[PDB]
RNA sequence: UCCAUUGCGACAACGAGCGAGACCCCGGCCGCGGGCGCCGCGGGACGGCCCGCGCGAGCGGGAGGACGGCGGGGCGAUAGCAGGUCUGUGAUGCCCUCAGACGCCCUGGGCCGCACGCGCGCUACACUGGCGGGGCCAGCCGGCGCCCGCGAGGACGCGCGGAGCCCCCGCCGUGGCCGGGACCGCGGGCUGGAACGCCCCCGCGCACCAGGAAUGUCUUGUAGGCGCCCGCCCCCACCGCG
């Protein structure tokens, strides 16, 4: 399974295909933002969305049945508070982009709601899985 | 990147508004050396400007020199924002604007002027170099 | 023998015997696994310490500076650098190079306080073999943090210049000048 | 000169001076089995290998 | 006080840097950075060249330090 | 008939808890089964300053309230309304363990 | 997040029922607030921590010193066993030690022939000790003169 | 001899008691029972075994063992201080105030003002590092979805739920520099009857190169480093208990 490959291959490998697939499609607020209040500065890679988009897709298949929530995906990418002569305290992410990489994966069926949150549906855990089964050689 | 070389143009230290830019660092912390431009400011006008960021300050060339130029006197239009900008709902005109060199000091000047004859509370403290917000006094910043 | 615990999986710990009998039974070099890590907690008795694996000592005294301390992995892995490049240089086995640091460094005489007389008064004495072995590493360690602050070179490449320069008996080095200062103020006053 | 190792069979109690020396006795095993007393710092224990850098002198 | 600078002015490439390293067994980026007083970057670059190259080869690598031996002899 | 009970006392100190546990349990063997539930203690925890005035070392107290609870929900529908009454009734009346009855 | 403590780790509900009964043994290993417990059946040799293999444990530096066991003892044994573990508590490495100890104390279990228990025990003891018997220590409380347990606040005379 | 007026052995003394220990809470190993949720009752370690000594009490070493020789806390003797508290109280003696009130209630201001001396803390002085991206584990204990908004926050609707350091890949390259983040200039929001209070965004970018005479704390999950919860609280933690 996925779990059976190191995380770091897959999903830079999976973030590639997906760019090529025209899957997903980074919007125009892209150019001028962070990722946190808890940030700085603005990432350094042009591709950093569909790294996004791969982590959290992995992040659904690991919970299976269970459900996610956007803010409970949001504390998976916190980071801590400099500069400020004041103790560091930890932050949360942001939610906007996050929103949007949800929507555009459910508008695909890849993903599926629920009583509460949403969750993977087969179709996403067959291409998960395919995936990583090509890129296990 | 990939580049080793100077090129044939390299220009071994820049000078634009009056200020003097250096070669060997990279692009958008040079331009933090003028006044009215810093980090976040930079990464989005160059990029407008279809400008590499992650290149040394002495491989750009004069076409790409000038294009920026273009983009710090009228950047609204080139579809940055208006919450990234130095001045937003001027006093006067009610417009929003970027303001480089020059235009800082002498703008600045002017404000008290207008907090002087207006006759406000932090007017009469600047002239008697206090702390203008309710920072506490008195126990520490001493001699 | 059947598992011979190459360290860092790479040089073999089978031929490495020290030459100094004095201070031969402090120093252990059959046991030390892999790693050089082991959550044991030595220094509970009074003379535990004199089995722990050299390395592992070695390590635990580069995370001194209340900066540094706790981190054990970054320590383990500066010391598997540093021994990829005496590989390199000297071309031998660098466990030999490091007992035959840690035993030209380490003084053989020492100065105390115990003549009164309202004065100095130091006395001329003598100094354990467990004593030696401590502040050999300590100045080994020492040595090579003074040089790689505010300084452009990292810290394994001092490390391994200090060891290498010790162990040539060399006074280029910090370990063997503070051994050599301590032998002389310690000889003027016996 | 040149400096000998001697062994350690008996030590003989601290002193009073902060009580950081030891005194020892200690045997040339070179051949000469010359058993005298010493001063030592740190900690020692029985057949300890000391090296000393004088072949005559005293303490007491 | 010191300063080094971070591209090479042409010909200096080759005349001196390729060819002293090439009389080197083993190199990192901040040894050479020390020797021919350029700055760390440049190091990376060249190095990267010459990996490609062949003559020298990686021993031990991770971001913070990785360390190679020529394979020229 | 069935009516799904459920027994819930509370108390401060862990003999009478205990004690009442027992007789319930050996009043309820035969209306049904009554197995006990034990849940993770509240504590309460409150912590003062030992002097009035604040004079001296700074010295604290540090008082505490466990409170200890049980939860039998084993008659479910093998106690009728009158049949939860029955033992209930029979249990000794400590004088300090509240108690509530809900379906 | 886990507690260690907890009914659902202890009989492990993770696994389906029908699959459950097939595990025959169980064991525990622990350091700090880190629990571990595997359940160890037949097969030919395969091993898991938390849905992952051995071989790709995450601090990376320690995967020897999860992996000590099998090259002390030999291959042998663990070809012939396969293993599911999960642990829940506190720290990477606290994690890490645990999980050699269930490791080690399970295969120790699995034979029955218990003179060739006791020469396994000497022959595993003596390269480590914690590797069997647990290690006690664990945090201890502060008090109120400062912000540690040893420490205290800084006096001034004057 | 003992950490201990803890004990042995003597004595114009004999015989008792308090304090010390014993005791209570927590933790570590095993068993029984029960079980929405790990929680109720017990066992276990005693200088007990071996070796040396010593009349003796007891000292040193080695074992086997989850743990080995007062493991962390609570309680805390007689006698006393002109120690602090009349501003904690329907605790109070004697004085002072008592209808232009020192009673009680309303509106504003102040307790925070600043040429100066010093006490506990916080942030840093960098490469054993800073920035960007990703992977991943706690405990006192614990609440979440969807949609707007760069964010902080907001509108609706339901009962459900955990991080920093660290590790991996890259950029910077000894420059008061991308170290550090005080001060100041435009702007957007929250609490509240009411901002002088607290959060977020763009720009500006102070002192500081490991600190004189002097001085404090500390022995195993300890120091140190890293963060997370409660208290007071309309809002707010560089504090305090953990």
Known sequence: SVTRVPADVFINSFAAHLKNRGIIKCPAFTDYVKTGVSRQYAPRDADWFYIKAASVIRHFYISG????????????????????????????????????????????????????????????????????????? | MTTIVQPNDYRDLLRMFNTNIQGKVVLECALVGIKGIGRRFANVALKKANIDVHKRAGELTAAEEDALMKVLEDPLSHGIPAWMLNRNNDFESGKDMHILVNTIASTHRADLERLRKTRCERGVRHHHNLKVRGQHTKSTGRR | ????????????????????????????????????????????????????????????????????????????????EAFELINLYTGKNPVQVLVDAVANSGPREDSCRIGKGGQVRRQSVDVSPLRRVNIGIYNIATGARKAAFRKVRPFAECLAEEIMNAAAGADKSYAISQRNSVERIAVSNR | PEPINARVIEVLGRTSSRGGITQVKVEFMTGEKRQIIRNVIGPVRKDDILVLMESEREAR | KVDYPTLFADEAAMNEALKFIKNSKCITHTQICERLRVSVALAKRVMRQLVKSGDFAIVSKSSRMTIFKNMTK | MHQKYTIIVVGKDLKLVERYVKSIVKEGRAFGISGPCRAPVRRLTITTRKSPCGEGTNTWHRFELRMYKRTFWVTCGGNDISTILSKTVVIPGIQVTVEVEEP | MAKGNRRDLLERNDIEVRERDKYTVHTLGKKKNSVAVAFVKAGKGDILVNNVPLALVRPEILRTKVSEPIMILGESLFKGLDMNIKVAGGGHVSQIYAVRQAISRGVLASVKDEAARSELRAKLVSYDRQLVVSDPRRCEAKKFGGRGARARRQKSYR
């Open chain 1, 65 to 137: 049945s269970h459900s996610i929530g956007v803010a409970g995906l949001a504390r998976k990418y916190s980071s801590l508070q400099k500069g400020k002569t004041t103790p560091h305290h930890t932050k949360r992410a942001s939610c906007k982009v996050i929103r949007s990489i949800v929507s555009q994966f459910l508008g695909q069926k890849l993903l599926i709601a629920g009583e509460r949150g949403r969750h993977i549906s087969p179709n996403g855990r067959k291409m998960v899985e395919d995936f990583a089964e090509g890129l296990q050689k």
């Open chain 3, 1 to 80: 023998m059947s598992l011979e615990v190459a360290l860092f999986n790479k040089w073999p710990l089978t031929d490495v015997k020290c030459q100094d009998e004095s201070l031969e039974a402090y120093i252990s070099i059959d046991n030390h696994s892999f790693v050089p890590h082991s959550a044991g907690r030595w220094s509970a008795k009074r003379f535990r310490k004199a089995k722990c694996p050299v390395v592992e000592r070695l390590t635990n005294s580069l995370m001194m500076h209340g900066r540094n301390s706790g981190k054990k992995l970054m320590a383990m892995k500066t010391v598997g």
